Design a protein around this ligand. Structure first.
Ligand code: APR
Lengths: 49, 42, 42
């Protein structure tokens, strides 16, 4: 599984045979723009299982 | 020319090994693309 | 070619050891990924 890893979530890193199904979390920085044209980068924990 | 697959084949009296000539480019995709589900970034 | 697992196997008269050639990259993930639950930061 050519997964994604790192902070800015590069699309091809962490290649790996396994696939965890447990309640983990990946932190990704996303740079989004508000309605007042003030762009801001923010992080989500993304609790997944 | 036939494709024999199965047990360990022994060539008979009137058989010779046939070299399958793949088109160019395809030979690179079989050596490189061992698993395209994981090897896809390049 | 078969996978014999169990007791201490002894090769018979017509058997030879078969080398399983893994695709490239997979051999690194078996030596490196001994425990991906703990070895995950890299
Ligand atoms: N080999 C793998 N197989 C399946 N899933 C994986 C694998 N490697 C990572 N993952 C999942 O993808 C996520 C990618 O995480 P990263 O971006 O590499 O790390 P980060 O997002 O900074 O933090 C994740 C945090 O969660 C914990 O599970 C882990 O200890 C880590 O500190 C991991 O958290 C994990 O749940």
């Amino acid at each position: 599984l050519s997964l994604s890893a790192g902070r800015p979530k590069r699309p091809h890193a962490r290649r790996a045979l396994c696939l965890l199904l447990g309640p983990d979390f990946f932190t990704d920085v996303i740079t989004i723009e508000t309605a007042d044209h003030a762009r801001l980068q923010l992080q989500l924990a993304y609790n997944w299982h | 020319v036939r494709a024999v697959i199965g047990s360990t084949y022994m060539l008979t009296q009137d058989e010779v090994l046939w070299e399958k000539e793949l088109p160019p480019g395809v030979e690179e995709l079989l050596n490189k693309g061992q698993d395209p589900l994981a090897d896809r970034g390049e």
